[PDB]
Design a protein around this ligand. Structure first.
Ligand SMILES: CCCCCCCCCCCCCCCCCC(=O)OC[C@H](CO[C@@H]1O[C@H](CO[C@H]2O[C@H](CO)[C@H](O)[C@H](O)[C@H]2O)[C@H](O)[C@H](O)[C@H]1O)OC(=O)CCCCCCCCCCCCCCCCC
Ligand code: CLA
Ligand code: CLA
Ligand code: CLA
Ligand code: CLA
Ligand code: CLA
Ligand SMILES: CCCCCCCCCCCCCCCCCC(=O)OC[C@H](CO[C@@H]1O[C@H](CO)[C@H](O)[C@H](O)[C@H]1O)OC(=O)CCCCCCCCCCCCCCCCC
Ligand SMILES: CCCCCCCCCCCCCCCCCC(=O)OC[C@H](CO[C@@H]1O[C@H](CO)[C@H](O)[C@H](O)[C@H]1O)OC(=O)CCCCCCCCCCCCCCCCC
Ligand SMILES: CCCCCCCCCCCCCCCC(=O)OC[C@H](CO[C@@H]1O[C@H](CS(=O)(=O)O)[C@@H](O)[C@H](O)[C@H]1O)OC(=O)CCCCCCCCCCCCCCC
Ligand code: HEM
Ligand SMILES: CC1=C(/C=C/C(C)=C/C=C/C(C)=C/C=C/C=C(C)/C=C/C=C(C)/C=C/C2=C(C)CCCC2(C)C)C(C)(C)CCC1
Ligand SMILES: [Cl-]
Ligand SMILES: [Cl-]
Lengths: 182, 31, 131, 453, 34, 333, 37, 79, 30, 30, 31
């Protein structure tokens, strides 16, 4: 671990998913920059059902506007075979989050307690919906001696709405993945 | 009245930025 | 007075405690058990408190003095499936926890009797703390 | 003589400054030998105090001991998992210190009450006699090096030291193969003092510790022989005044930095300060909390790696800024902690899920159960449990006490070094008693104002 | 940012070298008395 | 020699501002500190202070106030890690993670050490006694305890003093919640020192002002009675002494003035030393006095005291700071 | 606890740690005895 | 208590249920049938019979997505 | 006698005005 | 326009600080 | 930002109405 401590070697058996680009379709898909140092490895995860592992990674990418996207996937093999599928994106933060004003859904205020209801009720009553994302997994390199296949993906999943406060946008994600079918 | 907003602040600095200058010059002459 | 009187067993027999005996048990609560049971709950798991409603609703009913001493003889779960005397201090298992190696039967009796002769003294000041 | 204010120049409250003058060297030696006796007096008596109030039920660090752990670290008295095998070695060292205090107290009383007021023969030093003072420096360096090599030899041959990283628990073991690589040992000196590296506080095995001690023992034997055989060179003539207060000021500054370093060692390091004896560091206690809240959720069926916090980050396990698998929560700041009850959970990427879920080897939970609820938090009147909590628990950690005390000692000694540095420079210059009224240096200086000509 | 790291390393080197070699320029002789 | 000309110019007491060898280190450190602070206080983007992807908006152009602006401390995800401009990927995660705070702090702390050394330097070049640096070591100890020593002891640079007015207030409240500094005796000494230094400053100033020698008319300032460099004493120590002695008792008023000004130096300097040290031992979680549940009645019920009421307010602060960042019930350091 | 063979000192062992804190006090005592001459 | 919206901490309230019964009734979700907890897909007989006593409180009403977003029923975070 | 304001008093007055205005600006804006 | 006031006032403090160091009234010895 | 509009004009007359006074007083002293 001491060789990888400080380097970052982290960033069916354990299925790791390593993006290297984040195109958000702003109103075309433009590629920003990674503001969360290197913590985007969705790691240790014919049809494939989702499992445990780090099936979520919150990564804020950057006009000058931060987009905090919850990169996640919750829900024969040759060098052409693809496992196209769809996943259910949970909200960026769970309902026990509190805004700067004391309000939250599982825990928190129900209204703005600074002032004394009004046009604030879009930010007052917080919602927790679910989104869908389409992911197409390409298989390129297959090594059956170890028992493992690898390839690239493309995934389109929505970003955060701040508990229903701002219209999220879709982000395009590309990168190599590698798994051990067993 | 659809008047220039800064037309107020243009009017008053046009007429008191020189004015204080004159008073400075007068006061230092009188003393 | 009546605060001294506590449930002994599940059969039903309110046993009275000496004031000095209760104080002696109270001290030993703060030397081997206040490491993580200080206040009324457990620091390891913030759900298994040393309160009356929790101990009466334990399986088996551990809101009794003999019940608590027998717990200290054998750490089990809140339903009593696996006797895990290793994650907990245990009167038999002195090797994992050396805190009760010097405690006799009277020490266990006194520490178990002081836990059940506060809750009508305090009320909502031991159960989970005063918020 | 020079024992009052009038014939010394020094008031009662600055009266040990009456020993500065080079004809009063016997008293200088007496004050020192008696002070060393007082140091050994405390070293004996405080250890015997710790032994006399030692309860074997509580491990060592709940007792509030600070000298018991230093001895136990040396593999004396303790064995497997730092269990006290006998209370007699601690008593033997506590009495051996008392006897040394007695002998050193007699020497300090002799050279201050009855012995020769001025030293002579080969012991007469003047502060301006720079070859002699460097020669005394050299003897002190040589004797210090032979203590450092003797400690390294004991760590290698007789008995051993307590290795907290030994296979399972950590038993006393004698270091057979110390790290003699110059690349490794002096690579600690170039590590950044910042988090992750932790310049020399992150020495984390006994081979590195004893190899560095072998190196510095040899380096100090060499420097001591150098100063006995080579007087101060011409380039060290006008660098600073060669008075006695200068020499004191330089000692003060170095030992202030040294106290700051020891505060860092007692607070972060858990190899030279094994947590069986000193209790867990705050980083290791805060990872122990996460590890025990992890093992609570194993068994009651809460899959950890798919669990989000209030913020979408990992509820128990997340990824580092480097992208390594670390414990989630606020304890992500202590992702650099390396306790030996957690290293068999360490894989390649940090905390792999493989030897985490069907790992923990039972004691590893128990140990981390112990370090969770013994954290370095407390008060002046000895209580634990945060600060805004009920007082029942009567406990403050050894590491808290030692780090607090040596930051205090480092700060006062940095102040005292600045005091004596300024005063030594001013006293040698000839203006440490005030401005000369006859000629004041600012009156003979040209004006700083650009308009003034 | 490697070039900026080099610039910072050299700038720190230059200023600390100025400090160090300036305190080996016989600084105690820079007193008013002597 | 060009080098001798340089060492003459640096150590010159002819400069309008003395440079010296501590100043040749001090000036670039201030240049970086001042540049990055003026830059970040105005235009820094929001900083992810507690490592949970909740940017805190601390700069004056991000809808923020002179009172409420702050160079926001470095992210809790960073901890005590060295995080310069070049170890980050870009110039926008460095801004996002609070790198400006660490850059300002890592140049500000050595700049104050060099300012203290520079004070000694100029004392040496002018032939005056060398201990104004000792008096200056008290605010320097205080500002290193809350910028370096408390973050080291707690484990993160996010626990440092924010570079802002309301950030400072937030630091005070969170510190009271977590350490109970008001019941820390070093802080009671610091309060005695600052309030008594203000007492003694006002007292010494009023006494020297009250016993001034008549040199002027009533329609001109009494400050015209003093001439810069005059050798004569401008006030009456005897009259101020007699007044102060009649005010309280005989053996109370300083007759001596050298002792008097040593006391004026010593009281707030020593007490600020002690309160900087108090911050520093609370950095290792050695908190103030604890008197909760200390007065019991006959049965054992806790009778509330005033320390209990202070606890209850500190618990108020305690369960609201860093709300979305404590996943376990035990906020350790 | 200290060994039973030498378990006669009792309060002596209590006194010995704070023995050096009395030497600094006796310094002020001796200086008063000479009168801070 | 509902057995598709409610956490493990509110399965304390029942007379003797913590922790395995509660750790297994929650780990598989959603349950359509109210009596689907009694099939016990991997539990033993000492779990099965004891749950068979306790059927007077269980429900299958509504899994709220704000209450299931990855270990919210196990450790919500409220101590 | 005529009124004076020497240079030092001018600088002191300017700073006390400027710093006091910077202090109270945040509250005048609210 | 609220930041503009703050920056202008801060520039006024900085100008006063420069002019009170650079162009200060010289202290003459008596 | 819902800030006071006149808070700008309050800020600048608070800090330059005294300032010109001082400069008047200084200039007449210097001349
Ligand atoms: C400017 C410095 C800011 C950062 C200082 C800092 O983080 O100070 C703390 C560091 C100690 O570093 C800590 O060191 C630790 C080393 O411990 C590691 O190693 C130990 C080995 O047993 C344990 O395993 C422990 O668990 C494991 O973490 C970790 O690296 C921490 O992350 C790291 O913060 O102090 C040190 O460097 C020791 C020096 C203390 C004084 C510091 C002086 C300031 C630097 C002088 C300027 C250099 C020129
Ligand atoms: C570790 C503490 C320590 C030690 C070992 C010494 C040792 C010494 N001090 Mg000393 N001192 C100390 C702390 C200490 N001091 C403190 C805390 C103060 C302030 C009260 C003083 C103030 C002081 C003064 C004013 C003087 C000394 C002097 C001396 C020397 C002779 C003592 C004597 O007069 O004979 C007799 C002792 C009898 C008990 C009889 C001696 C070597 C004397 C000296 O400098 O000799 C030239 C002297 O004048 N000290
Ligand atoms: C190895 C460490 C060391 C040594 C040998 C000295 C030695 C000396 N110092 Mg000292 N000093 C030190 C550390 C040291 N200092 C530190 C760490 C500080 C910062 C606090 C100082 C600040 C200091 C000052 C301000 C002065 C000295 C002075 C002196 C000289 C005479 C002191 C005396 O007579 O005792 C007298 C001892 C007492 C009167 C008792 C002191 C009682 C203290 C204040 C309270 C104890 C509190 C304790 C922690 C509990 C002497 C050469 C004097 C000097 O400059 O001589 C020329 C003097 O003015 N030092
Ligand atoms: C580092 C500590 C130290 C140092 C440098 C000295 C140095 C000295 N001691 Mg010693 N002494 C010490 C500690 C020390 N002592 C201790 C701990 C004791 C108690 C056992 C003594 C008791 C002692 C006695 C009885 C005598 C000396 C004497 C001497 C002088 C002997 C000169 C010589 O050639 O040999 C010398 C300056 C002799 C002396 O006073 O010189 C005439 C002398 O007779 N010392
Ligand atoms: C604690 C141990 C110690 C101490 C106090 C000293 C003290 C001293 N040494 Mg040194 N020395 C030592 C260990 C020590 N040495 C060892 C272990 C070795 C090699 C095995 C040396 C080899 C050595 C040489 C060759 C010389 C000295 C010299 C000196 C004198 C002036 C050094 C100086 O100020 O420049 C300051 C520091 C540096 C130059 C190093 C740069 C560090 C940066 C500035 C921080 C001084 C008395 C000089 C001397 O006078 O000869 C006797 C000199 O020529 N020493
Ligand atoms: C006395 C002059 C001086 C000193 C002592 C420092 C010291 C420091 N600077 Mg620096 N800096 C300076 C002048 C100075 N600077 C000047 C004049 C500029 C602008 C031209 C900068 C611009 C700058 C940047 C952008 C950064 C630093 C950083 C640093 C820190 C880490 C850099 C390093 O390790 O280099 C050590 C020396 C060698 C390796 C040789 C360090 C404490 C880094 C930092 O603050 O990290 C938090 C950082 O990102 N500096
Ligand atoms: C101090 C004294 C200034 C006196 C001159 C002011 C000039 C007229 C000001 C009118 C005004 O409202 O300005 C304000 C305008 C702002 O712009 C105007 O704002 C108005 C206010 O609501 C309206 O909105 C107008 O539609 C809009 O165009 O700025 C200017 O056009 C001033 C330009 C001056 C250029 C001078 C060049 C001098 C060359 C040498
Ligand atoms: C010249 C320097 C003046 C410094 C003092 C200014 C006082 C604060 C000004 C804030 C402000 O915006 O005022 C403007 C307000 C106008 O009223 C306010 O206008 C604001 C601007 O949009 C907002 O609309 C507010 O909601 C509205 O209430 O007038 C006042 O309240 C000033 C009252 C001052 C009374 C002082 C009495 C002194 C007694 C002696
Ligand atoms: C940045 C915008 C905000 C501005 C903030 C700055 C506020 C400054 C307020 C006034 C302070 C100075 C008072 C007088 C000081 C003095 O007499 O100096 C006299 C000196 C000479 O020094 C002196 O010279 C004297 C002799 S003589 O002058 O050379 O003849 C001699 O007696 C004396 O000892 C020697 O020191 O020089 C001057 O004449 C200074 C007067 C300049 C006017 C003030 C500056 C105006 C702003 C300039 C920048 C324009 C900004 C444009 C953007 C809006
Ligand atoms: C003599 C000392 C102690 C006594 C009498 C004692 C008593 C008890 C009792 C009676 C229970 C069961 C209560 C319940 O869940 O309803 C319990 C549970 C618990 N105790 Fe303590 N305890 C002691 C020491 C400790 C210590 C020192 C720790 C610190 C690690 C600790 C940690 C726990 C934990 C984590 C639980 C919950 C475990 C579970 O659910 O089975 N105990 N304790
Ligand atoms: C010549 C010389 C000298 C001098 C020096 C000096 C004067 C110095 C300096 C210096 C300086 C003067 C420096 C500086 C600097 C700087 C820097 C380094 C900067 C920065 C920055 C940044 C990084 C920013 C950032 C940002 C923010 C924060 C916000 C917005 C965005 C941005 C990105 C823009 C002397 C005499 C001493 C002697 C020696 C030589
Ligand atoms: Cl946490
Ligand atoms: Cl907060």
């Amino acid at each position: 671990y001491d060789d990888i401590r400080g380097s970052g070697l982290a960033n069916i058996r354990s299925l790791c998913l390593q993006p290297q680009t984040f195109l958000v379709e702003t109103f075309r898909f433009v590629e920003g920059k990674l503001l969360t140092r290197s913590s985007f490895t969705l790691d240790q995860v014919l049809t494939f059902v989702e499992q445990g592992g780090f099936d979520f990674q919150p990564v804020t990418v950057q006009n000058g506007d931060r987009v905090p996207l919850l990169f996640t996937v919750k829900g024969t093999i040759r060098p052409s075979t693809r496992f196209s599928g769809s996943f259910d994106v949970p909200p960026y933060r769970t309902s026990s989050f509190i805004d700067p004003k004391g309000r939250g859904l599982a825990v928190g205020y129900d209204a703005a307690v600074g002032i004394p209801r009004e046009a604030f009720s879009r930010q007052n009553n917080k919602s927790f919906k679910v989104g869908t994302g389409n992911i197409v997994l390409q298989v390129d390199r297959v090594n059956q001696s170890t028992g493992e296949i690898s390839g690239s993906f493309e995934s389109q999943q929505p970003s955060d709405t701040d508990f229903g406060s701002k219209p999220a946008m879709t982000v395009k994600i590309l990168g190599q993945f590698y798994s051990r079918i067993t | 009245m659809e008047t220039n907003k800064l037309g107020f602040v243009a009017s008053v600095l046009f007429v008191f930025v020189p004015t204080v200058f004159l008073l400075i010059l007068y006061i230092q002459t009188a003393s | 007075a009546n605060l001294r009187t506590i449930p002994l067993n599940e059969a039903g027999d309110t046993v009275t405690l000496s004031l000095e005996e209760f104080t002696r048990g109270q001290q030993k609560f703060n030397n081997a058990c206040a490491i993580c049971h200080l206040g009324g709950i457990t620091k390891t798991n913030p759900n298994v408190g040393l309160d009356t409603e929790s101990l009466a609703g334990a399986f088996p009913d551990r809101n009794n003095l003999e019940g608590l001493v027998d717990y200290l003889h054998n750490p089990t779960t809140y339903d009593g499936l696996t006797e895990i005397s290793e994650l907990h201090p245990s009167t038999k298992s002195s090797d994992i926890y050396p805190k009760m190696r010097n405690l006799t039967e009277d020490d266990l009796r006194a520490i178990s009797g002081h836990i059940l002769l506060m809750p009508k003294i305090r009320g909502d000041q031991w159960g989970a703390g005063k918020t | 003589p020079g024992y009052d204010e009038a014939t010394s120049g020094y008031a009662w409250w600055a009266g040990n400054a009456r020993l500065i003058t080079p004809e009063l060297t016997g008293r200088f030696l007496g004050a020192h030998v008696a002070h060393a006796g007082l140091v050994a007096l405390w070293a004996g008596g405080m250890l015997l105090f710790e032994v006399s109030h030692f309860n074997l039920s509580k491990p060592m660090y709940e007792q509030g001991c600070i000298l018991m752990p230093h001895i136990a670290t040396l593999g004396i008295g303790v064995g497997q998992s730092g269990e006290i095998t006998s209370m007699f070695p601690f008593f033997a060292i506590g009495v051996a210190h008392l006897i040394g205090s007695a002998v050193l107290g007699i020497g300090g009383m002799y050279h201050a009450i009855k012995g020769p007021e001025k030293l002579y023969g080969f012991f007469q030093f003047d502060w301006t006699d720079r070859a002699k003072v460097a020669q005394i420096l050299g003897f002190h360096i040589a004797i210090l090096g032979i203590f450092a090599l003797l400690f390294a030899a004991k760590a290698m041959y007789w008995g051993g030291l307590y290795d907290p990283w030994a296979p399972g628990g950590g038993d006393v073991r004698l270091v057979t193969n110390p790290t003699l690589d110059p690349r490794i040992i002096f690579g600690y000196l170039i590590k950044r003092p910042t988090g992750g590296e932790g310049w020399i506080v992150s020495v984390n095995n006994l081979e590195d510790i004893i190899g560095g001690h072998i190196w510095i023992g040899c380096i100090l034997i060499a420097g001591g022989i150098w100063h006995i055989l080579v007087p101060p060179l011409r380039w060290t003539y006008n660098l600073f005044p060669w008075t006695g207060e200068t020499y004191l000021s330089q000692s003060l500054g170095n030992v202030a930095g040294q106290a700051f370093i020891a505060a860092a060692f007692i607070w972060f390091n858990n190899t030279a300060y094994p947590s069986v004896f000193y209790g867990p560091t705050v980083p290791e206690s805060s990872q122990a909390q996460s590890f025990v809240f992890l093992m609570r959720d194993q068994g009651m069926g809460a899959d950890v790696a798919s669990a989000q916090g209030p913020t979408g980050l990992g509820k128990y396990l997340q990824r580092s800024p480097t992208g390594e698998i670390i414990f989630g929560g606020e304890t992500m700041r202590f992702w650099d902690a390396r306790a030996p009850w957690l290293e068999p959970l360490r894989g390649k990427n940090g905390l792999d899920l493989d030897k985490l879920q069907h790992d923990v080897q039972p004691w590893q939970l128990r140990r981390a159960a112990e370090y969770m609820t013994h954290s370095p938090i407390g008060s002046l009147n000895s209580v634990a449990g945060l600060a805004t909590e009920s007082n029942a628990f009567n406990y403050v950690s050894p590491r808290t006490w030692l780090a607090s005390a040596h930051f205090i000692f480092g700060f006062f000694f940095l102040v005292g070094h600045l005091w004596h540095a300024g005063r030594a420079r001013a006293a040698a210059a000839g203006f440490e008693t005030g401005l000369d009224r006859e000629d004041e240096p600012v009156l003979s200086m040209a004006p700083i104002d650009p308009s003034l000509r | 940012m490697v070039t900026l790291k080099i610039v910072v390393y050299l700038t720190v080197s230059f200023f600390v070298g100025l400090f160090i070699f300036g305190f080996l320029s016989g600084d105690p002789a820079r007193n008013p008395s002597g | 020699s060009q080098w001798e000309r340089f060492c003459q110019w640096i150590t010159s007491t002819e400069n309008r501002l003395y440079i010296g060898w501590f100043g040749v280190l001090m000036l670039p450190l201030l240049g970086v500190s001042i540049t990055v602070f003026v830059t970040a206080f105005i235009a820094a983007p929001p900083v992810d202070i507690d490592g949970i992807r909740e940017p805190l908006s601390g700069s004056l152009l991000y809808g923020n106030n002179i009172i409420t602006a702050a160079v926001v401390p470095t992210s809790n995800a960073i901890g005590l890690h060295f995080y310069p401009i070049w170890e980050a990927a870009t110039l926008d995660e460095w801004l996002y993670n609070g790198g400006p705070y660490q850059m300002i702090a890592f140049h500000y702390i050595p700049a104050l050490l060099c300012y203290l050394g520079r004070e000694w330097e100029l004392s040496y070049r002018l032939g005056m006694r060398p201990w104004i640096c000792i008096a200056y070591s008290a605010p320097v100890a205080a500002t290193i305890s809350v910028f370096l020593i408390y973050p080291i002891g707690q484990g993160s640079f996010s626990d440092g003093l924010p570079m802002g007015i309301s950030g400072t207030f937030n630091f005070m409240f969170v510190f009271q919640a977590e350490h109970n500094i008001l019941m820390h005796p070093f802080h009671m000494l610091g309060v005695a020192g600052v309030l008594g230094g203000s007492l003694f400053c006002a007292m010494h100033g009023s006494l020297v002002t009250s016993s001034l020698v008549r040199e002027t008319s009533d329609s001109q300032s009494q400050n015209e009675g003093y001439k810069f460099g005059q050798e004569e004493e401008t006030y009456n120590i005897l009259a101020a002494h007699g007044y102060f002695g009649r005010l309280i008792f005989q053996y109370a008023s300083f007759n001596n003035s050298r002792q008097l000004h040593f006391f004026l130096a010593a009281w707030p300097v020593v007490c600020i030393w002690f309160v900087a040290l108090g911050i520093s031992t609370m950095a290792f979680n050695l908190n103030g006095f604890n008197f909760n549940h200390s007065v019991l009645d006959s049965q054992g019920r806790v009778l509330p005291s005033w320390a209990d009421v202070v606890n209850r307010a500190s618990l108020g602060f305690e369960v609201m700071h860093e709300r979305n960042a404590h996943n376990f019930p035990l906020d350790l350091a | 606890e200290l060994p039973e063979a030498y378990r006669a000192f009792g309060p002596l062992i209590d006194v010995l740690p704070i023995l050096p804190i009395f030497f600094l006090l006796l310094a002020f005592v001796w200086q008063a005895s000479v009168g801070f001459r | 208590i509902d057995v598709n919206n409610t956490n493990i901490a509110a399965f304390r309230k029942h007379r003797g249920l913590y922790p395995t019964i509660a750790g297994k009734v929650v780990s598989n979700a959603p349950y359509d049938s109210i009596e689907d907890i009694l099939d016990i897909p991997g539990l033993r007989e000492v779990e099965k019979d004891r749950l068979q006593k306790n059927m007077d409180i269980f429900t299958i009403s509504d899994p709220v997505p704000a209450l299931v977003e990855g270990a919210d029923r196990f450790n919500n975070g409220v101590y | 006698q005529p009124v004076e304001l020497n240079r030092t008093s001018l600088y002191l007055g300017l700073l006390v005005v400027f710093v006091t205005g910077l202090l109270f600006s945040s509250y005048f804006f609210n | 326009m609220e930041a503009v006031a703050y920056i202008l006032i801060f520039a006024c403090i900085i100008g006063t600080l420069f002019f009170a160091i650079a162009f200060r009234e010289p202290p003459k010895i008596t």
